[PDB]
Every structure is written in structure tokens, then in C-alpha cells.
Design a protein around this ligand. Structure first.
Ligand SMILES: Nc1ncnc2c1ncn2[C@@H]1O[C@H](COP(=O)(O)OP(=O)(O)OP(=O)(O)O)[C@@H](O)[C@H]1O
Ligand SMILES: Nc1ncnc2c1ncn2[C@@H]1O[C@H](COP(=O)(O)OP(=O)(O)O)[C@@H](O)[C@H]1O
Ligand SMILES: [Mg+2]
Ligand SMILES: [Mg+2]
Lengths: 539, 523
């Protein structure tokens, strides 16, 4: 019937069965454990033993603990009952709001959609971000990679992508938090409680987002499989409901990282730099399920953390081929103060094609990339010569590309709470003309800093107005400002009198709520019969 | 060779019995001839097969749990880490020279736990919970596990309260939050312990001023440091009074590798008491790159396969499950917080190391300490283009938020100009002016050691540089000009600015009034 725990090394449990072994990728329950511990069969060890990875911590497991087979892989609730809920890797509600009332629980493991059911149409997903929609335009029904190191703005960009696309999409979205901070998961959950994407109580069914969370405090088995749980929620929303789905995956790098933490304990000799030998095929088996079939559509946005800003690291370098669009975020762009820190050259999309987006959009994007590459080639001789002799053809292409660099920046709606500037949504025909004007030369009379952190081209020519009014200030300094006390302001000692004085306890509250139990000086052991005895004084 | 005839052999097929009835009455008189050489058999107790380098392979111990405290017969404790099929791999909490082959190992019944509570507040502790300061055992304290799972999404709330550190470079540019994990990273002797220590001293200075619930209880975990440094830190914290709110967990270099591995978890479990009982905690994991090294040794001697720089594969999970326990709880869980300050030492400024990149990807903010800024007089050596924080606004002083934006922008103006400091053309007196203000700002941001500043005296001092009031002095005496500013502006400004939090429109008036009323000696 059941099996027993044979070996526990870290997050990898060897379970021995006496006849009728479970299949690979089957789910096993451990009973006698405090919390619900789910093991997924990774391989067959060979002498009627399976080797598993755990979905929770293996602290507490006993060699010989009864492990029961489920006969199926990890099954999770999918459907309309999961909208507005937070799930585990194994489909438990962790939002503390009842059970998940969804019918037809599905396995998280299936094969990829086959070759004949592949869609070939390409329509542009307009996001409102004038560096995304211009240079590397996204595709609805396509896969999007948000590359970039630690601190460059992947989570802020995916928050703005949620706040732009997923609210005005109609269909359902799925967020898969794969190995990230729990604090920003709580931030996303709160910011979708207020914005009405997630609703609570009786109006729960009017929610449009399903959260599946596998964050950093989880063991490496729970981070390796939580992307499959978010993906099978999105696959139910694509295949059965027929809807068009959004699948935001925060740090798909942590999938490969979580598979790397267990692969030495699974008996695999290591590959290149320290990843598993099965890196490309695990990533392919995950990512080929995220497709647009003939039944429905999944538009996936994926953050990819590059380790130490290395794009040649094999875990993002494998990810690069599975994506339709690619938004590489660069640290040196964010060091200029430009946000979002999208590399305007290194970002690529399949939609940048004159047969798809039009020969005006394509040519203005190629012209912006041409003038930015020209400025990047001139940045060498500027720091040795000084940009004074370049004979007004290379001195103009520096100023135009600097206006383009400042014009690629954009204030975000989600970044108001740490910049202050209100966010901007810039439409596609509204950014093509705005970049065509600064490309052809319609805005050389404007100041260079006026392009920084604005929206449309009808905002740079107002920041020029406000800049030339604000430099029209700071002109006179005789008197009549706030510092002369005669206007409306009290003395400095009278403002002190307006302070309410707070209490000070000086006892810190540590003597009234603590259950100060007694701990033994001697150490207490268990003998052969399991009884609690003191340690025997004979070494 | 397969198991089917191997199970058929369980059925008897001997067909003759001319040895069975001969040796069965000959076995027991033979075994009794050697019963003083036999050791008694073992099932639920343990017996040491092999011991060496801090690892005991223990035969028996049938019902041990993974990660369970065991106790050898010589008194030294252990921890059952990898439970293999024929033996248990036990790491030794101490010197393994008192363990022999054939020593009895006793299962204690408990997963590893430390004493938590208010009784630890003021003690110097080892990495396992025993006090090492020579002041007797721990009283008014209770035992709690060191492997508590971090609070989830519904248990947390957004980080809002500041927890100032007293270092005005930090509190102006990289503002901490009260439940935020902030990594102090740099080379050796670049001032990381100084930043953590000044943070603890400033919590001592603020705990005697706030009403009993914004009080911050520091916990310092010294991993891998020598014992003279820990004793000097205890002398510092007692001679300034910071030891009344500070716990110190000290697994030194002489301790075993599992003690240094387990000491950040012991310190986090001691600091989670204040987080779970509504108070606010501050935890400093000094030398987390030494806890990773102790974990590497502990796992390599358990014969687990090595990875990048021979580290374990799960060395990311080691620091992620530790640092994720620093949270800000919801109001139904008390609202208590715990803010982490892990420390990583880099080698020659290589930020692309394995443990360094892992802990950068785990924590919220970063505090980079470069060794070239340290020797240029900039103390603390904050790398302002690389030190990031996730919170930014809504986690700092509202008065400092109005002033430090003009600092964050103008230091960026200074940095993009100073890479053209070989020629000196001084373009239109604008590239000359922005460096002539940015040098003043970097000289403003310097401060001494073991002397933290209250936040009002910081946001007055940056007010005197983001505005005018210091353009008349050279860059060589701004560290004395700001002493003239704080020393001669009337101290009733600081009370109003602390009680308001921001500058009221009656307060920036009086502050611009009194920054010309003072005589600064800059000539
Ligand atoms: N703000 C400061 N002003 C002056 N000196 C400082 C300051 N901060 C640190 N120092 C000096 O720098 C030296 C190194 O300090 P600290 O021990 O904090 O660095 P560390 O990185 O912890 O060193 P280690 O890597 O050896 O642990 C100390 O001798 C200290 O006196
Ligand atoms: N659009 C933006 N505007 C302003 N600041 C930003 C923006 N995007 C990112 N940042 C800064 O970068 C920091 C970290 O960004 P984050 O989204 O956490 O990147 P990652 O997830 O890759 O670490 C934030 O604290 C913020 O200050
Ligand atoms: Mg992130
Ligand atoms: Mg140090």
C-alpha cells in the first residue's frame, strides 16, 4: 500500500516501497508530520526506492515514516474559484479566506502544446511605455522577457505592466511569484486589493487575478514547481475557459536556481558554471507550455534576473531563445537616473519588422537605435577631446541622442510613491510622432533636460515653459519672504509651546506578557524505550 | 541477480540438515566465549561508527528526526543532519576530540532550540544559547526553535516606520525601513561593522526618548570573528549603555563549524521574540560570508557534492530562509517588526562573487563601501551610485525627504562631471559650479565613528548645504562648518523639527533666519 522514508538528505527524501512503485512526477503525502509535507517523485533509485523532492521542510522526518502514494501528480484547484485567491505550490489557500471552491482540480504536469496548434498572428500589445512600445514592441499572445540584474527595476516594470495591461485587458491574469521577496508579494496583493483587481468576500467572483506564490523562504522543491502551478492555472484559463490570459512570472530565474539546489542531491554531476545538466530541457519543458494555442491565448511577461549583470550566464542565456520580445534592463542606464532603465539597443522584439508594425514605426525605431549607437561610438572621443571640434554633424547627433535618451524615460504610476512625479501613459501613435520630431529635428530649440521624466511630446514643450519660468525666478533677494517674522509666523519659542508632550515608561513592557518557563541546567535525553531520562554520567 | 529469485530464497530449499542441527547447538556456546568483546546492540540509542573533523557517523538512532539535537555520552551536543539508510550524519556542537568509536549517542527529542525572551536582553551568548559572559545562566527566558518559517503574505504589512541609523549618509541617501533587510557590503576594513555599531548606538540614544513601543532591541550576531573583537564590542556597548537593549550572539572562530552556521539562526530566533510580541527588533548578521563558509565546511565533511567555489547547491536557501524572517507584521499579529543588516565581505571589490550576489538578490537595499572612497577621506565610504534601497520614500523622515532629493540629484550631477576632471575647461561656470557644490555635499556627508547623530540634527545639516549657507567656505572645513551649524543654531529648532517630522512653513523661515545668525569659521 504505502512506502516508508529511507533517507533524508536536505530537501531530498528517499522513499522505499515494497512493490508497486509510484510513477515519476507523482505526488506523495507524508503522514505523521506536523505540517502537510508533499513529496514529488524525481527518479527511481532502483532497489524499490524512489528519490523525491519535498514541497515543504524536511525537518522532522523519521527513517521509516509512512509515506502514502496519491497515484497522481500535484493537483491544484483551477477555475473561477481561484480568481482573487493566493495559492501555494500545492494549491492551498494562504490568503486565510476559506477553502478554494474551484471544480476540476488539475495536475501541474502536462506536456507542451504540439506543433499544429500554434498561432502565427502578430498583433502589438500596447503598454503605454514609450521605450517598450517604440523600440521593442510587445506582442499580444506572446512571451516577454524582462532581463536585468538586482535593483534595476524588474519588479517596478512588471508592476507597471500589470497596472497598464491587466486592468484594461478583460480576461484573467495569473501572477506567479517564483522565489521572490514575500514583502513585495504582499505589496502586489495590497495594491490589487485597492485597485479592484482582487475583491474579497461575496464579490470575490468579480476578481481578475489569481496569485500563486513560491517565495524565497520556501524550500527549493516549492520554488521549482510553483511556476507549474501558476502555469496550470493559466492553462485552464486558456484551454477550457477559452479566455486570453496574462501570466506574469516574477523571476523565472528562480525556477532554474531551485532546480540547481537539488540536482547534486539527485545524483547529477554538475554542468557548466554550477547549474544542473538538465537546465535547457527543464526550462524548455516549462516554457513551451506557455504558448498561444488555437483554443486560447497566454500573454506571458517574465522577469529574468541576470546574475551580477551577466547576460552570458547560462540561466538567462537559455531563457533568451524562448521569448518573442526581450526588455533588457541595464544598470548603467539606471546610473544616469533614466527610468525605466531599458537598454535601447540590447532590447529586441519579433514585432520590430516593417511588415508588422508599419514602415513609419519601424523606421523611426531604427533611426533612434542608429543615433544612439552613433552617440555610443562618440562617447569614447568625447572623454578625450571634449566635444568641441566635431564640425556640427557629430555635435548635432550627440544632442539629438541625448534628447532621445532623456525622452525614453517615463514616470510610472507605480513609482509615484518613491519619486513623487505622477505617472504617464503614452500611446503608440503618440510616441512615434514624438520620437520622429526629435529625430528629424523639430525640437532642437527645446532645452536638453526638458525631455526628462515626461509623457508625451506635449509635455517637454511645457517643461520647457516651466524651466524658463523657474530660471526667470531666483533673480531678486532684498526682503519680503517667509524669514521676516512680521507676516504670520510666531516666535521660535512659541512654536515649541505647540508641541504635545509624549509619555515615557522606562520599563519597556517585558514583565507582564511573557511565559517565563524553566529550562533545566542538565541535559535531558531519551533512552532505548523512549522514556525521558537525564544524561547518564558515564562517558 | 534480480530480486525475484532473491525473494525465492526466503522460502526454505535446503533438502538436508547436516549443518543446521549441528551448529545451532554450537553457536550459543561459541558466542558466549566472546561476550566481553561484544558491545550491546543498539536500536533507539546511537553508537559512533566514525568520528572526525566535527562529523560523527552514528549507527542506530532509529527514530531521530532530521535536524534534531542529539547528545553524545561525553556531554557534547550534536545535530542529526543527513539521515542515511545505515547511519546518521551528526555534526558536533563543539570539539569532537571527546567522541570515540563506540560512544553512545542519545536522542534528545528536540529539534534545535535557543532560549528566547527578555532574559537574553543584555547577555553575551554563544551560537547555541548558552551565556558566555560569566554572569550565570539565563533567567526569565523560554526555549524556541531556530527553524521558524518566515511570516507569509497575509501576516505582513507595508514598511512605513523609519528606524533611523544615526549615519547621515545612510539616513539621507539609503533610508532604512523598520522591517527592511539592508545589506552592508564591502571589502575588508571598509567600515561595515562601524555602520552596524553606530546603528545600535543610535537605537540606544532613541530608546530613551520614544514611548515604549517604537523602542528598538538590537541583536548582534558575530559569526567567525575573533573573541577580542567581540569583547571590545561588549566593552563599547557597556560603556555607552547600549547593552541594555542589545543581545550579542557570539560564535567565534574557535567555535565549531555548526555553531557558526547556527548562530545567525540563533540570533534571528532571539530577535523574533520582539517581532512577535509587538516590539521592534534590529538584527545584524555580521560576517554572513563566514556563516556561508562554516556551512560549506559542514556540508563538505558530510560528503555532499560541492558547487560554485565548492559551496553547497542550497547555499542560497541558507540565507534566503534566514533573511526572509525579517518582516513587518500586520496589526492582528502585533505590528512588530524586525530589520536585518547582513554583512558580506567581498574580495578586492568583486561584487560578482557567489554569496555576495545571492545576498544582494535576497535583501531589499544595499550599502556599498568602497576602499577607494575610504582612503579619500569619505567616511563612511558609501558608494552613492551603487547603494540602493527599495523603499525610498515612505520610510524616512518627512523633513529629510524634502531635503535629500536635492542631495540625491546633485550628487548625481557631481558624479557625471567628475569623470572629466583631467582637463579643467570649467564649461560656462556650470560644470565648475556643480562640482563645487558636490564636493561640499560629499564633505558634508562625512562623520566620525561611534558618534551617531539624531535625525533632526542631520536634516538641519543637509538643509545648510542643499540651500546656500555654505557656498562661502572651502571644502576643507565643512566638517567643522557643520559642527558650527549644529552647535550655534538654537536647539529649539531641533525640538520643533522632531515633533513635526517635516519642516512647517513657520520652521523653514526660522531655519533660514538662524543659518545667517551663526558665525561659521570658514574663510
Ligand atoms: N566613520 C568612520 N570614521 C573614521 N573611521 C572609521 C569610520 N568607520 C570605520 N572607520 C575605521 O575603519 C576601520 C575598519 O572598520 P570596521 O571594522 O567597521 O570595518 P570592517 O569591514 O568591519 O573590518 P573587517 O572586514 O576587518 O571586519 C576601523 O579601524 C575604524 O576605525
Ligand atoms: N520606474 C522607476 N522609477 C524610479 N525608480 C525606479 C524605477 N524602477 C526601479 N526603480 C528603483 O529601483 C529599485 C529596485 O527596483 P526593483 O523593481 O526592485 O528591481 P529588481 O526587482 O530587479 O530588484 C527601486 O527601489 C526603485 O527605487
Ligand atoms: Mg524583483
Ligand atoms: Mg567586521
Amino acid at each position: 500500500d504505502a512506502g516508508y522514508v529511507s533517507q533524508v538528505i536536505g530537501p531530498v527524501v528517499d522513499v522505499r516501497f515494497d512493490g508497486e512503485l509510484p510513477s515519476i512526477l507523482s505526488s506523495l503525502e507524508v503522514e505523521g508530520h506536523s505540517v502537510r509535507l508533499v513529496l514529488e517523485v524525481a527518479q527511481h533509485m532502483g532497489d524499490n526506492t524512489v528519490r523525491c523532492i519535498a514541497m515543504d521542510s524536511t525537518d522532522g522526518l523519521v527513517r521509516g515514516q509512512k509515506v502514502v502514494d496519491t497515484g497522481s501528480p500535484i493537483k491544484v484547484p483551477v477555475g473561477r474559484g481561484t480568481l482573487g485567491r493566493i495559492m501555494n505550490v500545492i494549491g492551498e489557500p494562504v490568503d486565510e479566506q476559506g477553502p478554494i471552491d474551484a471544480a476540476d482540480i488539475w495536475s501541474i504536469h502536462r506536456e507542451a502544446p504540439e506543433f499544429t496548434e500554434q498561432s502565427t498572428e502578430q498583433e502589438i500589445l500596447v503598454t503605454g511605455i514609450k521605450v517598450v512600445d517604440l523600440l521593442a514592441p510587445y506582442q499580444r499572445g506572446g512571451k516577454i522577457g524582462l532581463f536585468g540584474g538586482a535593483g534595476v527595476g524588474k519588479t517596478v516594470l512588471i508592476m507597471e505592466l500589470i497596472n497598464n495591461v491587466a486592468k484594461a485587458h478583460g480576461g484573467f491574469s495569473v501572477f506567479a511569484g517564483v522565489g521572490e521577496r514575500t514583502r513585495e508579494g504582499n505589496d502586489l496583493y495590497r495594491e490589487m486589493i485597492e485597485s479592484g483587481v482582487i475583491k474579497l468576500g461575496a464579490e470575490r467572483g468579480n476578481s481578475k487575478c489569481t496569485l500563486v506564490y513560491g517565495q524565497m523562504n520556501e524550500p527549493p522543491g516549492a520554488r521549482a514547481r510553483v511556476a507549474l502551478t501558476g502555469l496550470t492555472v493559466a492553462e485552464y484559463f486558456r484551454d477550457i475557459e477559452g479566455q486570453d490570459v496574462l501570466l506574469f512570472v516574477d523571476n523565472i530565474f528562480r525556477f532554474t536556481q531551485a532546480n540547481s539546489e537539488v540536482s547534486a542531491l539527485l545524483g547529477r554531476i554538475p554542468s557548466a558554471v554550477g547549474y544542473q545538466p538538465t537546465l535547457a530541457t527543464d526550462l524548455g519543458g516549462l516554457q513551451e507550455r506557455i504558448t498561444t494555442t488555437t483554443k486560447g491565448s497566454i500573454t506571458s511577461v517574465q522577469a529574468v534576473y541576470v546574475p551580477a549583470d551577466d547576460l552570458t550566464d547560462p540561466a538567462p542565456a537559455t531563457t533568451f531563445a524562448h521569448l518573442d520580445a526581450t526588455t533588457v534592463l541595464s544598470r548603467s542606464i539606471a546610473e544616469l537616473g533614466i527610468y525605466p532603465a531599458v537598454d535601447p539597443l540590447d532590447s529586441t522584439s519579433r514585432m520590430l519588422n516593417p511588415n508588422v508594425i508599419g514602415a513609419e514605426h519601424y523606421n523611426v525605431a531604427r533611426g533612434v537605435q542608429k543615433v544612439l549607437q552613433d552617440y555610443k561610438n562618440l562617447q569614447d572621443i568625447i572623454a578625450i577631446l571634449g566635444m568641441d571640434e566635431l564640425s556640427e554633424e557629430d555635435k548635432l547627433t550627440v544632442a539629438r541622442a541625448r534628447k532621445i535618451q532623456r525622452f525614453l524615460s517615463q514616470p510610472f504610476q507605480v513609482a509615484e510613491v518613491f519619486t513623487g512625479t505622477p505617472g504617464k501613459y503614452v500611446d503608440l501613435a503618440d510616441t512615434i510622432s514624438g520620437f520622429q520630431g526629435v529625430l528629424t529635428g523639430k525640437y532642437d530649440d527645446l532645452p536638453e533636460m526638458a525631455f526628462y521624466m515626461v509623457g508625451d511630446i506635449k509635455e517637454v514643450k511645457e517643461k520647457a515653459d516651466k524651466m524658463a519660468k523657474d530660471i526667470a525666478s531666483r533673480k531678486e533677494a532684498d526682503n519680503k519672504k517667509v524669514s521676516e517674522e512680521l507676516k504670520d509666523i510666531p516666535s521660535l519659542d512659541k512654536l515649541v509651546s505647540e508641541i504635545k508632550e509624549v509619555v515615557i515608561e522606562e520599563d519597556d513592557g517585558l514583565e507582564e506578557d511573557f511565559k517565563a518557563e524553566a529550562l533545566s541546567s542538565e541535559t535531558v535525553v531519551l533512552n532505548e524505550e523512549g522514556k525521558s531520562v537525564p544524561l547518564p554520567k558515564k562517558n | 541477480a534480480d530480486a525475484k529469485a532473491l525473494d525465492e530464497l526466503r522460502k526454505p530449499k535446503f533438502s538436508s540438515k547436516y549443518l543446521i542441527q549441528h551448529v545451532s547447538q554450537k553457536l550459543i556456546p561459541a558466542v558466549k566465549e566472546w561476550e566481553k568483546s561484544y558491545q550491546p546492540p543498539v536500536i533507539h540509542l546511537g553508537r559512533v561508527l566514525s568520528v572526525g573533523d566535527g562529523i560523527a557517523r552514528v549507527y542506530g538512532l532509529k527514530s531521530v528526526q532530521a535536524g534534531e539535537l542529539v547528545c553524545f555520552d561525553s556531554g557534547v551536543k550534536g545535530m542529526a543532519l543527513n539521515l542515511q539508510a545505515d547511519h546518521v550524519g551528526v555534526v558536533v556542537f563543539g570539539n569532537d576530540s571527546v567522541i570515540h568509536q563506540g560512544d553512545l549517542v542519545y536522542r534528545t527529542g528536540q529539534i534545535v532550540n535557543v532560549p528566547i525572551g527578555p532574559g537574553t536582553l543584555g547577555r553575551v551568548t554563544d551560537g547555541l544559547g548558552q551565556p558566555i559572559d560569566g554572569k550565570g545562566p539565563l533567567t526569565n527566558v523560554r526555549s524556541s526553535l531556530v527553524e521558524v518559517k518566515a511570516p507569509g503574505i497575509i501576516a505582513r504589512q507595508s514598511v512605513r516606520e523609519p528606524l533611523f541609523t544615526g549615519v547621515k549618509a545612510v539616513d539621507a541617501l539609503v533610508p532604512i525601513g523598520r522591517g527592511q533587510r539592508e545589506l552592508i557590503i564591502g571589502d575588508r576594513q571598509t567600515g561595515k561593522t562601524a555602520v552596524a555599531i553606530d546603528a545600535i548606538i543610535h537605537q540606544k540614544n532613541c530608546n530613551e526618548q520614544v514611548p515604549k513601543a517604537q523602542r528598538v532591541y538590537c541583536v548582534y550576531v558575530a559569526v567567525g570573528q575573533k573573541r577580542s573583537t567581540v569583547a571590545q564590542l561588549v566593552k563599547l556597548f557597556t560603556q555607552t549603555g547600549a547593552m541594555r537593549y542589545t543581545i550579542m550572539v557570539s560564535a567565534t572562530a574557535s567555535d565549531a563549524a555548526p555553531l557558526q552556521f547556527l548562530a545567525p539562526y540563533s540570533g534571528c530566533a532571539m530577535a523574533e521574540y520582539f517581532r512577535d510580541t509587538g516590539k521592534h527588533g534590529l538584527i545584524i548578521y555580521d560576517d554572513l560570508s563566514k556563516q556561508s563558509v562554516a556551512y560549506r565546511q559542514m556540508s563538505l565533511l558530510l560528503r555532499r557534492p560541492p558547487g560554485r567555489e565548492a559551496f553547497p547547491g542550497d547555499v542560497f536557501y541558507l540565507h534566503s530562509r534566514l533573511l526572509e524572517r525579517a518582516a513587518k507584521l500586520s496589526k492582528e499579529l502585533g505590528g512588530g517588526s524586525l530589520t536585518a543588516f547582513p554583512v558580506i565581505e567581498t574580495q578586492a571589490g568583486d561584487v560578482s562573487a557567489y554569496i555576495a550576489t545571492n545576498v544582494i538578490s535576497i535583501t531589499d537595499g544595499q550599502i556599498f563601501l568602497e576602499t577607494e572612497l575610504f582612503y579619500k577621506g569619505i567616511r563612511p565610504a558609501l558608494n552613492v551610485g551603487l547603494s540602493v534601497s527599495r523603499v525610498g520614500s515612505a520610510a524616512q523622515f518627512p523633513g529629510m525627504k524634502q531635503v535629500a532629493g536635492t542631495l540625491k540629484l546633485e550628487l548625481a550631477q557631481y558624479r557625471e562631471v567628475a569623470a572629466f576632471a583631467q582637463f579643467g575647461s570649467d564649461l560656462d561656470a556650470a560644470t565648475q559650479y556643480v562640482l563645487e557644490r558636490g564636493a561640499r555635499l560629499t564633505e558634508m556627508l562625512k562623520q566620525k565613528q561611534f558618534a551617531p547623530i539624531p535625525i533632526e540634527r542631520q536634516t538641519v545639516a543637509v538643509y545648510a548645504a542643499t540651500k546656500g549657507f555654505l557656498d562661502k567656505v572651502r571644502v576643507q572645513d565643512i566638517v567643522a562648518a557643520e559642527e558650527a551649524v549644529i552647535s550655534q543654531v538654537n536647539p529649539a529648532v531641533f525640538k520643533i523639527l522632531k515633533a513635526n517630522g517635516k519642516i512647517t512653513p513657520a520652521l523653514d523661515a526660522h531655519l533660514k533666519a538662524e543659518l545667517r545668525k551663526v558665525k561659521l569659521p570658514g574663510a
